[PDB]
């Protein structure tokens, strides 16, 4: 249900979709192809759902990290530009959009989070994070808040968590180690501890999301925010006298923003592949094409050599890139979505008080690694019916903590009924039955109707 002879593009909401729409109009009456730009919610999870059944957009615009995941599902068509086109862009930005050696998207621009401050409210910005509590109770007197940023997305809070010692996956021998997740070490705790300290002291609202912190800075109510290059145009509309600068440093260590490369991937199920190609290559990735989007919302540092020479002299890009230099580029492995979600959970729970940091982070460790919880790791080993020819249900646990050992498919598995003297678990003469199904998955339901 995604038609031919027309281009439908999906970009994030905060990006320059209007500038991209202007590039669409230029392309519309140059060939004769209808180009329309949409910006839907949860776009980065919508796409792998709609496109997975042949029906996504033609082009999708996201940070390079999500693309690795999509690539694996084969939602993205592999793009082959002649080596002569690849010269227009910086050679290293092509690596960002590489998965299994296949080039999967076109690198557009580099964005990293920067500390934006109000030159008027705060003349000299804070070098460290520890001085913010001190420099808030000062501003709170004069009816203002010191620091406000989106606490709802991990992309924003992670630079702080990462500052001391935290990281996603350890880069070992030209690769990423997926069992090794440092989302919960000493440095990661110190980061999230101090972040909660700001909430459980009324320095920052744990409610605060994007448009809230966005509107407040533009009204002139908050001293500092943390945002990306896209944010700059609304701060211009409001005509605040502002400065983009390096993020504060926590425990002497610099803050480590994860750095994204905005990329454009072509939908595999799309029939308009070459049509899209000529749009991106010939129209979008060019001086005017990138100027249009940058006119709408600033892109950060672009990947296009020619245009970047110009953007380079902008003092705001200088600070953006100086921040990116302290941080790391995102991995584009599929385990990233797990990591991101693993942290969203943790930061949310810690913020609301739902969990103490150590608890929230231990869960985050489990989630990002995608392993069993401490409680359940002992099910892993179990497979009391094994050395298996054919399909299997892998050792799993159910919602009571009953291990279901690895079994060949199409077989009724039996395990003793749990019972509980208060917390204390024990086994009865009775049996819980569960079928390891013919297709290799455990039956959703465990028949526990005999343990009375």
């Amino acid at each position: 249900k995604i038609e031919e002879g027309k281009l439908v593009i999906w970009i994030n909401g905060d990006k320059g979709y209007n500038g991209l729409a202007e590039v669409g109009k230029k392309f519309e009456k140059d060939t004769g192809i209808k180009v329309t730009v949409e910006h839907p919610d949860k776009l980065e999870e919508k796409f792998p759902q709609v496109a997975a059944t042949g029906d996504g957009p033609d082009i999708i615009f996201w940070a390079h990290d999500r693309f690795g995941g999509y690539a694996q599902s084969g939602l993205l068509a592999e793009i082959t530009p002649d080596k002569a086109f690849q010269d227009k862009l910086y050679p290293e930005t092509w690596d960002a959009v590489r998965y299994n050696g296949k080039l999967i998207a076109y690198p557009i621009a580099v964005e990293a989070l920067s500390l934006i401050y109000n030159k008027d409210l705060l003349p000299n910005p804070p070098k460290t994070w520890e001085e913010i509590p001190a420099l808030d109770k000062e501003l709170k007197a004069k009816g203002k808040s010191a620091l406000m940023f989106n606490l709802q997305e991990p992309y924003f809070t992670w630079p702080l968590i990462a500052a001391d010692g935290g990281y996603a996956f350890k880069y070992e021998n030209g690769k990423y180690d997926i069992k090794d997740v440092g989302v919960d070490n000493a440095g990661a705790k110190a980061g999230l501890t101090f972040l909660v300290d700001l909430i459980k002291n009324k320095h920052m609202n744990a409610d605060t999301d994007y448009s809230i912190a966005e509107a407040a800075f533009n009204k002139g109510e908050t001293a500092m925010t943390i945002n990306g290059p896209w944010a700059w145009s609304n701060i211009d509309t409001s005509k605040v006298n502002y400065g983009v600068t390096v993020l504060p440093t926590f425990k002497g260590q610099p803050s480590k923003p994860f750095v994204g490369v905005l990329s454009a991937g072509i939908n595999a199920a799309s029939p308009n592949k070459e049509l899209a190609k000529e749009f991106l290559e010939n129209y979008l990735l060019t001086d005017e094409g990138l100027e249009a989007v940058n006119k709408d919302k600033p892109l950060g540092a672009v990947a296009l050599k020619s245009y970047e020479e110009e953007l380079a002299k902008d003092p705001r890009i200088a600070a953006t890139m100086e921040n990116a230099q302290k941080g790391e580029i995102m991995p584009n492995i599929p385990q990233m979505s797990a990591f991101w979600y693993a942290v969203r959970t943790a930061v949310i729970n810690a913020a609301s008080g739902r969990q103490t940091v150590d608890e929230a982070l231990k869960d985050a460790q489990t989630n990002a690694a995608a392993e069993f919880s401490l409680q359940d790791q002992h099910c892993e080993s179990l497979s009391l019916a094994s050395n298996i020819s054919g399909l299997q249900c892998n050792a799993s646990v159910d919602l009571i903590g009953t291990c279901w050992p690895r079994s060949p498919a199409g077989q009724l598995v039996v395990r003793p009924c749990p019972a509980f003297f208060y917390g204390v678990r024990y086994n009865t003469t009775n049996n819980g039955y569960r079928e390891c199904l013919a297709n290799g998955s455990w039956a959703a339901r465990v028949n526990y109707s005999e343990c009375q």
């Binding site: 159910d398 919602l399 009571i400 749990p418 509980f420 339901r445 465990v446 526990y448 109707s449 343990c451």
Partner: peptide, 11 residues
């Protein structure tokens, strides 16, 4: 126990 019979009926 009780909040665990309730669980086991659903589970």
């Amino acid at each position: 126990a009780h909040s665990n019979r309730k669980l086991m009926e659903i589970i």
